[PDB]
Amino acid sequence: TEFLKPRLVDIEQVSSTHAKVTLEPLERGFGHTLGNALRRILLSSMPGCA
């Protein structure tokens, strides 16, 4: 078990409701693995009031 672990580098909080997140490094095949799960949960699982 010799994994790799990122520190969160830079957040470009331009406005509040808009943002950019960088992250580096990972192991290979992990920029696909995490962010596909992360795009899913941030589309379809939150609270809400409408």
Binding site: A37, L38, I41, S45
Partner: peptide, 13 residues
């Protein structure tokens, strides 16, 4: 990201 930790909690045990 905390809920993805919450859904794996059957497997830290």
């Amino acid at each position: 990201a905390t809920i993805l930790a919450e859904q794996l909690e059957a497997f830290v045990d």
